[PDB]
Amino acid sequence: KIRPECFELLRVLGKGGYGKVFQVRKVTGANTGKIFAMKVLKKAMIVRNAKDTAHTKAERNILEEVKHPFIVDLIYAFQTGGKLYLILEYLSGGELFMQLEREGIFMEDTACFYLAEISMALGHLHQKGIIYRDLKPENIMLNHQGHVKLTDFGLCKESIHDGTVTHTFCGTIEYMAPEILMRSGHNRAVDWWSLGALMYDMLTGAPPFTGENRKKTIDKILKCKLNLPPYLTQEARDLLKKLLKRNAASRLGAGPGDAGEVQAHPFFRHINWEELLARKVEPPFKPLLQS
Ligand SMILES: CCc1cncnc1N1CCN(Cc2nc3cc(C(F)(F)F)ccc3[nH]2)CC1
Numbered sequence: 001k002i003r004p005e006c007f008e009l010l011r012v013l014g015k016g017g018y019g020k021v022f023q024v025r026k027v028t029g030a031n032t033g034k035i036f037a038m039k040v041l042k043k044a045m046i047v048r049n050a051k052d053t054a055h056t057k058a059e060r061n062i063l064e065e066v067k068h069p070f071i072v073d074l075i076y077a078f079q080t081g082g083k084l085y086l087i088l089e090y091l092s093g094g095e096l097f098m099q100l101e102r103e104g105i106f107m108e109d110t111a112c113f114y115l116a117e118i119s120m121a122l123g124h125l126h127q128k129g130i131i132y133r134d135l136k137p138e139n140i141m142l143n144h145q146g147h148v149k150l151t152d153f154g155l156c157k158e159s160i161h162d163g164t165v166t167h168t169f170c171g172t173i174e175y176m177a178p179e180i181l182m183r184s185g186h187n188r189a190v191d192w193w194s195l196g197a198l199m200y201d202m203l204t205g206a207p208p209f210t211g212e213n214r215k216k217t218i219d220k221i222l223k224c225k226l227n228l229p230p231y232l233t234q235e236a237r238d239l240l241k242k243l244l245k246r247n248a249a250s251r252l253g254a255g256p257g258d259a260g261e262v263q264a265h266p267f268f269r270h271i272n273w274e275e276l277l278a279r280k281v282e283p284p285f286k287p288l289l290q291s
């Protein structure tokens with residue numbers, strides 16, 4: 001019988017229109033002393049909106065059935081009259097965004113590591129019928145060792161929203177596929193575009209299609225006129241060209257091979273997928289050692 005009173009609030013990890021994420025300590029039971037992350041959703045707001053309700057149930061179901069080392073673990077879920085609670089593993093490594101902002105640009109073997117781990121998470125979600133959509137660096141966390149964790153499966157985390165039918169334009173749209181922005185229907189190919197955009201950001205310091213305003217940023221994304229940096233290896237350039245294509249069906253990973261098709265690319269040739277999945281490959285950055 002898990003109740004709100006079983007946890008002590010330590011601090012706020014995030015705050016949005018739909019609720020808050022806390023670092024908490026369990027103070028009862030066999031996990032006494034153990035640290036978790038706790039998402040607390042405001043029920044009253046969600047219940048009114050039918051698609052907000054659906055999407056909230058969806059996140060629960062998703063994390064309940066997913067189990068993979070590169071995806072965040074859900075431990076408990078419970079409810080009161082006013083609140084919905086998700087108890088997830090606490091990830092002390094911070095957002096991948098922080099590493100990139102620290103470093104400016106990643107070396108290629110640094111990028112390769114993260115992108116490889118992410119590709120295995122995506123392959124797992126794709127086998128389960130799940131589409132991540134947005135691989136902006138703030139949507140990816142690191143655990144205590146420095147390994148990747150995908151975390152963004154729930155409601156829009158933003159404090160103000162764009163429109164009142166979708167939550168597509170509320171955050172940055174710089175890592176999203178053209179077909180998502182056009183709302184013309186899409187599938188898992190959307191994730192491989194986004195991996196390409198993340199990769200481009202890692203290796204050049206900014207996402208591939210940016211404008212001074214949103215309307216121009218959107219136009220740039222739909223146009224999809226890619227600028228490949230000359231200083232990147234031929235392997236990195238070949239992979240970026242195959243991910244960032246306007247024709248979704250023709251992206252690497254779009255076909256039946258999915259992740260295995262991307263994982264076979266020469267850019268990832270030094271990866272042992274057995275060791276990586278087992279988390280035996282040393283990460284490029286150790287959050288524990290970070291001053
Ligand atoms: C929950 C997994 C996690 C594990 N360990 C440490 N940090 C974590 N999170 C990862 C997610 N992150 C971004 C974030 N998501 C949010 C969702 C909401 C919502 F309530 F949905 F409105 C509000 C603020 C939010 N901020 C905060 C820290």
Ligand SMILES: [Zn+2]
Pocket residue numbers: 156157158160161162166167170
């Ligand atoms: Zn929103």
